[PDB]
């Protein structure tokens, strides 16, 4: 906040939605609750300058959980390689993954 | 074929989006928005957002109705334009269809699109999450908390809309 | 417009800007901008002249486009970070989208062809309110997000503003038009120092607010809108235009007038950051701003201009309106250099 | 599946009825049977020039009021909360401003239709 | 950036209880009261460890205790239970409101033949306590080392040395 | 902007063809920007004259880029001295006269030489020195 | 350079911590100049309002100077507080980080090789 | 970041492009203005639903509340420009060139 009246006046106006690990209705946790919880607990009061260099892997795990960028990339490679291998005829899916 | 309707629905959303962005006659622009708006409601419904999907359906329909209700009121052309009509709108239209159809071709043939951000084609069904929701729909309880957790948002939204009626009369009054 | 509705319409504008400077949530910041735009459009077309309608219109499309781009840049930041707090932007495209999204609200780079004629069409009263109050909100957002700003883009935003603002003012006669380009010139000055020290642009904002305020309500008292119409004020009100000299000199930064305090203090800060070529540049191109200030000074009372015989009974009557802080505003707008170290109060 | 099959069947049924509407009855038409209807005598030339109605002010407030009903739509699930005092105060608050907007719209000509 | 220690398939080969949802819905209250101890222990492992891969065995105990509950019901009140869950299954929403009479047969059967009392309203929703002998996981989230705090702000304040120290301002 | 660094990728003097081509591309690219604006805010009349205006500005800017390319490499080759502000200075009426010849006029062309003369000298000064324009915030 | 330092209570003009600093002297030339600003503002007021400039209504004039000195006083107290804070984080960080500010030995003029440029 | 994100992001670009190329109609211009609002609403809905950001599900609603509010402002401005100048092509309001 530019002029932090919420901190001074000691009431909440929007510091209840700004994060995913806040008190959600009926304690419905978000997808990446644990990932961001570690990240915020990591860089709390340390400052933005120190946060961007020290709490880096915690952010990367959290940002990955948000998008699954690498995990979906891993799945994309599994399916593509499986497709060409099955199409050529080296190996066929086992009966558990048919029914 | 029912592989994942998300892309198909979003494609019609873009083609409908292309339409009124090409500057037709305003009434035909309403149709181009409505198809995108209707299918956009379909996209959100498919993602679990049942309430929000029909929500944008009801509000927009009323919103765009007064839009082209106005165009025939005082913005109508004595000879209205059409999707073909002038070469400018024709050029603006066909440009949009060939554009989007190029990106989707660019999208579905390598699955590693890197325009601006990263876009990999693997299926929007994947990003879904495994887990129950108890006996409540998550979206409905989230927008229900507006009256319990969002009392600040209600005040600013209510006051702005009340001011919204004041400006509308004050602007339109004149003299 | 009835007086009571006008007050509440203004209070909504001040509340909309205040919401921007106190909220920590990106959606609320966007809301504060939306309320600011919504309550201002009626203010511009208060008198309902034909000009004001498209003047208010050009306001609307420009700022709505800016607001929509700002919303989009917020959304990407949420997508890549899952955060609504105003700390920094974790997607470079998200930031590189907001700079112009906020710029068009400020009117700095070629996102500025709305500022001149929106000032021209609307009345002088809303012109003052447009060029001073409407800049606290977008600048406040920039000050908070000042950490994650692309210096190459932000500096170019300001450098373009100074050049165009100075160049454009040389070919203006309508006093409102010259004020808009002059305001655009000061836009670059405040925004150039933004990446380095945010305390400095606050200081330049405060000085520029007093300059634009004191200049405008002098124009209100003179009841003039073009250079020729201002010229005759020497016959009626000599002190107003004589005071207008010092404010014009101060607005050009000619020291030891208060207007030097930003231009001086800013240059000192960037040279601390090994920026030398660029500070020399705006030092050079601030002079074209000074040109049409002196031409205004020459035309107002430095050389008494031909008068009109219909001015006799004009001298027989005095102003009934009661501009306040005008005697105060001139003091801060002219002589505060001895209290320069007070910038640390902002810090 | 179920919803889209129902949507499909309705539009095919409607379109088929159009197809048999314009094809089963054969046509013996000319340029005078296609003339626009104006209760007999010749039209003076209209139906696309600006036809300015008067309820534009209340037409656009409907759009504002339709947003109020969007805001107060989630009320059925809002009652299932543990802090009804705050929910009741806010729920009535939106209704009050909705009533207040209508009342102020009423007093200043407003709902009156321009002459 | 590591491995994933998926448990042996053998570990995921415990007895898989086979009753339809209506059968479980009919047992409900009586099952909850007479099978709470293994149920509570397993979920406490679920909430504490936050890792089912560390709580399979507690899941197995639930299945074994679930079997004994259902093994007893066939041995004693198979018929009224079969009458009851059939009546629940017909309804599309599986409401207890429409099968009170069959319920009245069922609960009295297990009361006078298996010593079971239907828990009162809200009784099954109470918060329970268990005495699990597993240790509390010190790092359930496997949190990394917390960052060191920035140098603390302290010390006494004295007048600024030589005033503002900015250009020609001596004071 | 990678094409801009392509000027520094090839060392001065050598690759005189490449340096001229690089600056021609730099000029032509910048020519597209100004033409794109001018065709936008200054109203056109037809497609034919619109590209004609585009062609004129692109021709000047590409030519201005080219000659500064040749003058830079040949000067660093005839003297065999890379680090020389004069190497870019001789680009003065190289650029000024040609731009004043593309729109043939002695007034603009002759008066031009100095302006990008020292400018080309000054950009060479920052090339050799550690001068920065858009300096990041150190303090 | 200071809005992010820990313990900075927002919207709080003069911290209770700042009372340990010398209050600005009443004779402080910075303060008395701000009084002149009030005096000058009074004269400007009568000029626009077409009043007997210097000898016009003193109550309007005397209010201006009395107001300016007051808001001048707390601004001057805030002046030195921030500067003292600048000088507080100055030396605490210098002591906390000694190695990046090494102590320079003495290498007196009798030993430097510094040359003399012949000014002829 | 699957292809549905590409579709609506690229969609918003054409809404941006469509708005920034006023051809002959203010009403059609306002159409592209409200067009932007679809992609922003739809993308926002996809984000906070995918991430189960339940408390943030109100954000698409508040977008719509301030959405039609601008839409009303645009048409109300369009009322007078068309009323006193006859049509809505954005070319006849150049009296403010000087
Ligand atoms: C720096 C920090 C200090 C800032 C100081 C600001 C100084 C303002 C000087 C005004 C002096 C009076 C004069 O000659 O006024 C001309 C002029 C009014 O012109 P006029 O022709 O005399 O007006 C005739 C009335 O409209 C005739 O009335 P009507 O029948 O038209 O009804 C409307 C009337 C109704 O007025 C009332 O009801 C009162 O409206 C007004 O009078 C306007 C003010 C309304 C109340 C605003 C309360 C704000 C708190 O004043 C304004 O236009 C004021 C604009 C709004 C306030 C200032 C906004 C700009 C400052 C923003 C930056 C602030 C600092 C940021 C850091
Ligand atoms: C102002 C103008 C500044 C110089 C612009 C470039 C002129 C040039 O190329 O000069 C090369 C020549 C060649 O100089 P030089 O290379 O023999 O020596 C320069 C100094 N050292 C050796 C340290 C690199 O330099 C000058 O002419 C310098 C002139 C300086 C004074 C200019 C006064 C202008 C009035
Ligand atoms: C950063 C800034 C520099 C780089 C960017 C700009 C590069 C281009 C600069 C030229 C822009 C256009 C100039 C037009 C022009 O010169 O018109 C003919 C101009 C203007 O002609 P004129 O219109 O005055 O001609 C008529 C004159 N009267 C009215 C008296 C009859 O010609 C002249 O000014 C006279 C000839 C040139 C004299 C000076 C030449 C040497 C350079 C001196 C400055 C050195 C530093
Ligand atoms: C005379 C010539 C020179 C003029 C220089 C400027 C003087 C006018 C401005 C001074 C008064 C306004 C600022 C101080 C104030 O009222 O509150 C300060 C502040 C207001 O809170 P604040 O500092 O959070 O509000 C503004 C926020 N920043 C700094 C980002 C612009 O009071 C505080 O308690 C500040 C605490 C943090 C201090 C570090
Ligand atoms: C330096 C400041 C002055 C810069 C030059 C100003 C222009 C040259 C001076 C003459 C201006 C024309 C004029 O008429 O000047 C006199 C005018 C008041 O004229 P009059 O009403 O006759 O005065 C009655 C006094 N009882 O009174 C004035 O013009 C007063 C000028 C005041 C200028 C601002 C001072 C601010 C504080 C320093
Ligand atoms: C003309 C615009 C400036 C750019 C021209 C292209 C040359 C260039 O490289 O400019 C960037 C410049 C030099 O840095 P670099 O890009 O690394 O190349 C030299 C080797 N390092 O980056 C710099 O910071 C060096 C200084 C650039 C020139 C500054 C002075 C320009 C002339 C006076 C002002 C007009």
UniProtKB/Swiss-Prot annotation, chain B:
The keyword Mitochondrion applies. Signal peptide: none annotated. Pfam families: Oxidored_q3. One of its GO terms (biological process) is mitochondrial electron transport, NADH to ubiquinone. Disulfide bonds: none annotated. GO terms for molecular function: NADH dehydrogenase (ubiquinone) activity. The chain crosses the membrane at residues 1-21, 25-45, 47-67, 88-108, 149-169. It is a multi-pass membrane protein. It catalyses: a ubiquinone + NADH + 5 H(+)(in) = a ubiquinol + NAD(+) + 4 H(+)(out). Its EC number is 7.1.1.2. It is found in: Mitochondrion inner membrane. GO terms for cellular component: mitochondrial inner membrane; mitochondrion; respiratory chain complex I. The keyword Transmembrane applies. Belongs to the complex I subunit 6 family. Core subunit of respiratory chain NADH dehydrogenase (Complex I) which is composed of 45 different subunits. This is NADH-ubiquinone oxidoreductase chain 6.
UniProtKB/Swiss-Prot annotation, chain C:
Pfam families: NADH_dehy_S2_C, Proton_antipo_M. The keyword Transmembrane helix applies. GO terms for cellular component: mitochondrial inner membrane; respiratory chain complex I. It comes from the Eukaryota. Its main location: mitochondrion. It catalyses: a ubiquinone + NADH + 5 H(+)(in) = a ubiquinol + NAD(+) + 4 H(+)(out). One of its GO terms (molecular function) is NADH dehydrogenase (ubiquinone) activity. Keywords: Electron transport, Membrane, Mitochondrion, Mitochondrion inner membrane, NAD, Respiratory chain, Translocase, Transmembrane, Transmembrane helix, Transport, Ubiquinone. It is a multi-pass membrane protein. It is found in: Mitochondrion inner membrane. Its EC number is 7.1.1.2. The chain crosses the membrane at residues 3-23, 25-45, 59-79, 89-109, 149-169, 178-198, 200-220, 237-257, 274-294, 325-345. It is an enzyme of class 7 (translocase). GO terms for biological process: mitochondrial electron transport, NADH to ubiquinone; mitochondrial respiratory chain complex I assembly; reactive oxygen species metabolic process. Core subunit of respiratory chain NADH dehydrogenase (Complex I) which is composed of 45 different subunits. Interacts with TMEM242. PANTHER family: NADH-UBIQUINONE OXIDOREDUCTASE CHAIN 2. Core subunit of the mitochondrial membrane respiratory chain NADH dehydrogenase (Complex I) which catalyzes electron transfer from NADH through the respiratory chain, using ubiquinone as an electron acceptor. Essential for the catalytic activity and assembly of complex I. Belongs to the complex I subunit 2 family. This is NADH-ubiquinone oxidoreductase chain 2. It comes from Sus scrofa (Pig). The gene is MT-ND2.
From Swiss-Prot, chain D:
The chain crosses the membrane at residues 3-23, 55-75, 86-106. InterPro entries: NADH_UbQ/plastoQ_OxRdtase_su3, NDAH_ubi_oxred_su3_sf. GO terms for biological process: mitochondrial electron transport, NADH to ubiquinone. It is found in: Mitochondrion inner membrane. Keywords: Electron transport, Membrane, Mitochondrion, Mitochondrion inner membrane, NAD, Respiratory chain, Translocase, Transmembrane, Transmembrane helix, Transport, Ubiquinone. One of its GO terms (molecular function) is NADH dehydrogenase (ubiquinone) activity. It catalyses: a ubiquinone + NADH + 5 H(+)(in) = a ubiquinol + NAD(+) + 4 H(+)(out). It is a multi-pass membrane protein. The keyword Secreted does not apply. Coiled coil: none annotated. Its EC number is 7.1.1.2. GO terms for cellular component: mitochondrial inner membrane; respiratory chain complex I. Belongs to the complex I subunit 3 family. Core subunit of respiratory chain NADH dehydrogenase (Complex I) which is composed of 45 different subunits. Interacts with TMEM186. Interacts with TMEM242. Core subunit of the mitochondrial membrane respiratory chain NADH dehydrogenase (Complex I) which catalyzes electron transfer from NADH through the respiratory chain, using ubiquinone as an electron acceptor. Essential for the catalytic activity of complex I. This is NADH-ubiquinone oxidoreductase chain 3.
From Swiss-Prot, chain H:
It comes from the Eukaryota. The keyword NAD applies. It is found in: Mitochondrion inner membrane. The keyword Transmembrane applies. One of its GO terms (cellular component) is respiratory chain complex I. GO terms for molecular function: NADH dehydrogenase (ubiquinone) activity. It catalyses: a ubiquinone + NADH + 5 H(+)(in) = a ubiquinol + NAD(+) + 4 H(+)(out). Its EC number is 7.1.1.2. Keywords: Electron transport, Membrane, Mitochondrion, Mitochondrion inner membrane, NAD, Respiratory chain, Translocase, Transmembrane, Transmembrane helix, Transport, Ubiquinone. It is a multi-pass membrane protein. Gene3D superfamilies: 1.10.287.3510. The chain crosses the membrane at residues 1-21, 29-49, 61-81. InterPro entries: NADH_UbQ_OxRdtase_chain4L/K, NUOK/Mnh_C1-like. GO terms for biological process: ATP synthesis coupled electron transport. Core subunit of respiratory chain NADH dehydrogenase (Complex I) which is composed of 45 different subunits. Core subunit of the mitochondrial membrane respiratory chain NADH dehydrogenase (Complex I) which catalyzes electron transfer from NADH through the respiratory chain, using ubiquinone as an electron acceptor. Part of the enzyme membrane arm which is embedded in the lipid bilayer and involved in proton translocation. Belongs to the complex I subunit 4L family. This is NADH-ubiquinone oxidoreductase chain 4L. It comes from Sus scrofa (Pig). The lineage of its organism: Eukaryota, Metazoa, Chordata, Craniata, Vertebrata. The gene is MT-ND4L.
